[PDB]
Amino acid sequence: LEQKIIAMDLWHLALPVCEIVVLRLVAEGGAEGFGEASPWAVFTGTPEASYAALDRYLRPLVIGRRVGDRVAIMDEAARAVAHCTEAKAALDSALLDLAGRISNLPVWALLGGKCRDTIPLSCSIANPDFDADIALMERLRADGVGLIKLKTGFRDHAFDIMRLELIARDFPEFRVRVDYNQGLEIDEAVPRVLDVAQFQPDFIEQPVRAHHFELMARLRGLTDVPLLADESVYGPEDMVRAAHEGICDGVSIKIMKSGGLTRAQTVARIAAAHGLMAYGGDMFEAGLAHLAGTHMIAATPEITLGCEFYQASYFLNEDILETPFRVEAGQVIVPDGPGLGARADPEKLEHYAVRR
């Protein structure tokens, strides 16, 4: 691990169904590490921002550094550029993937070990054309997927209720989660949440804008259905604040928000210390990001509500991995191979790139 990182390559991809930024690091010894940043322009930041963060601001910080100084590198990285937690997460992933390759260890082994070999998978239901999702749900049920998360709030309230009712009638096999993606306005939050809570989903995710800690805390006191914070919490700092103000019953943890795998674990551990639950959320990512999140969760017993790394299997027309992101009988398979467990395909990276 005394080896020096000698190169940094980047790709700004546009995947048919979704833009992401892929990073590759190369050590003196020839080993390579991959990492993905999956920005959501309106929430975490743009792909351009993360591309620049890596290409111009973090590059000088990483090139020439020893693979083993990851802790120092990530500490400096957080301060070297503002935001771009997706880019920071990509760097951490590549650093870990690289160290894992060098030492011949899976990433979870560099995160403390593993506590689970599989992770329950959840697929989101967010199509404005519900008939298309019904067909999707038929397939999900057939594939053994047992969890689904209804994206709510993007249309009228009636549209949300309609779907919950049909799901309960024709797809009772699934456990159902709900996610508003900060979608509701102040004047409609309470009545819409209270109505949806009647359906008793496993949890309702972030009904209002991230900065609405007061309102989130109030919504939490309205029903016994768990209220999960997502956009309101990125890292440990926000988690401490969220816990203090009692804005949620649990949190959706994403490496793209925490800016790294360790910071993601810290969020989960702080949530647990406050008696709050944790879920493996994700952004609109590809298989590389899925693998990074999978290794993180495999080493974090505190995240018990499953994960939602469903895009590579049900959203993207084609993924960027050389080998399919492994999911069997509705469960994500924790890889045990070196590094992340799969390489990104250069040809696909070259083909789908809009910039590199």
Residues making up the binding site for Mg(2+): 179, 205, 230
16: contact with a copy of itself by CB under 8 A: no
Q: Is 237 in the site for a copy of itself (CB under 8 A)?
A: yes
* Strand spans (E) along the chain: 5-14, 19-27, 32-37, 118-120, 122-125, 147-151, 175-179, 204-205, 227-229, 250-253, 277-280, 303-307, 327-328, 331-333, 353-355
Active site includes 188? no
Residues in contact with a copy of itself, shown as a per-residue x/- string from 82 to 121 under the rule CB under 8 A: -------------x---x---xxx--xxxxxxxxx-----
Q: In terms of CB distance, is 112 or 128 closer to a copy of itself?
A: 112
The sign one gets for the Cα dihedral 340, 315, 85, 344 is positive
Task: Give catalytic status of residue 308 as yes or no.
Answer: yes
Token pair 């593993």 in the structure block, residue: 114
Out of 9, 48, 55, 69, name the contact with a copy of itself by CB under 8 A: 69
Rounded Cα–Cα distance for residues 135 and 123 (Å)? 13
Backbone angles phi, psi at 156, to 5 degrees: -70, 165
User: Which ranges of 113-188 does DSSP label H, i.e. alpha helix?
Assistant: 130-143, 157-170
- How far apart are CB 85 and a copy of itself at their closest, in Å? 16
**Nearer to a copy of itself among residue 104 and residue 200 (C-beta):** 104
Q: Which residues are annotated as a binding site?
A: 179, 205, 230
Asked if residue 246 binds a copy of itself (CB under 8 A), the reply is: no
Backbone angles phi, psi at 349, to 5 degrees: -65, -35
Q: Which is nearer to Na ion, 75 or 214 (CB)?
A: 214
- Residue 336, interface with a copy of itself (CB under 8 A)? yes
Q: Does residue 106 sit in helix, strand or coil?
A: strand
Rounded to 5 degrees, what are φ and ψ at 272? -60, -40
Q: Among the options 151, 254, 257, 348, which is catalytic?
A: 151
Q: Which residues are tagged catalytic?
A: 151, 308
**List of residues contacting Na ion (CB under 5 A):** 220
**List of residues contacting a copy of itself (CB under 8 A):** 1-2, 67-73, 75, 95, 99, 103-105, 108-116, 236-237, 239-240, 244, 262, 266, 269-270, 273-274, 299-301, 336
